Enzyme design. Structure first.
Site: not given
Ligand SMILES: [Cl-]
Length: 253
Positions: A30, A200, A220
């Site tokens: 990520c 994240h 995302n």
């Protein structure tokens, strides 16, 4: 003056990357996805559309030695430093197989229902730093590098973040993921149940308000099946899950 809503996709619609949702697959990359997505957006926005490229997640993931642990997670600031110093080559998703170094890993469902195989809990080893464009791509690796001029953390202030996004484009941002985030389907997220799963990294593309409730609009990197066609919204203005405290970006000029 800051408008009540803003959506980078609507301000710079020529820039194809801004409305592209990616998939990190079975890899804690990520940190690299939020980076190359925002860098792709900003390269296009800040060049008046002259650069209209998809930057390679695997190049950054595999080659940045100062960015952490690859598929076992990474660090935002050094990813933007790497873009400034070394640059990042082009590369699409696995299925699109375009650019210098397309991503090696397939789409999978991240704790949600849909048409892709479930990601599951195993993670891939960090790919090797190959420094070689795919056979059909006829630019040598070093000559396909796209570089930034500067990188920086954005001030932990709502208005500063809004001004940065509106003027210079989407930003990367870290936040703390709790177990209830994995149950997100739609709406304005806030942490209500569950324990921490660590940090994240995502891409903030805008903001808005619904029924008086302010939010950030975020891409995302869990493919289009996750959340609101790949996006989510999260409470804005209260440093929810540290969303206003870990913003990083950079400029090409
Ligand atoms: Cl990708």
């Amino acid at each position: 003056e800051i408008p009540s809503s803003f959506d980078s996709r609507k301000k710079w619609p020529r820039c194809k990357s801004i409305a592209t949702i990616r998939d990190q697959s079975r890899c804690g990359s990520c940190w690299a996805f939020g980076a190359v997505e925002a860098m792709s957006d900003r390269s296009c926005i800040q060049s008046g559309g002259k650069q209209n490229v998809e930057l390679s997640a695997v190049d950054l993931l595999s080659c940045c030695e100062s960015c952490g642990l690859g598929c076992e997670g990474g660090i935002l600031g050094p990813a933007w430093d790497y873009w400034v110093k070394e640059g990042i080559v082009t590369g699409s998703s696995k299925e699109n197989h375009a650019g210098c170094e397309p991503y090696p890993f397939p789409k999978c469902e991240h704790h949600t229902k849909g048409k892709y195989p479930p990601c599951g809990s195993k993670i891939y080893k960090t790919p090797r730093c190959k420094q070689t464009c795919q056979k059909k791509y006829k630019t040598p690796y070093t000559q396909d590098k796209h570089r930034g001029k500067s990188s920086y953390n954005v001030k932990n202030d709502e208005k500063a973040i809004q001004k940065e996004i509106m003027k210079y484009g989407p930003v990367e941002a870290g936040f703390t993921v709790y177990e209830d985030f994995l149950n997100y389907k739609s709406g304005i997220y806030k942490h209500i149940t569950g324990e921490t799963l660590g940090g994240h990294a995502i891409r903030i593309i805008g903001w808005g308000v619904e029924n008086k409730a302010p939010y950030w609009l975020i891409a995302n990197s869990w493919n289009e099946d996750w959340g609101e066609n790949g996006y989510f919204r999260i409470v804005r203005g209260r440093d929810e899950c540290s969303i206003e405290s870990e913003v990083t970006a950079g400029r090409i000029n």
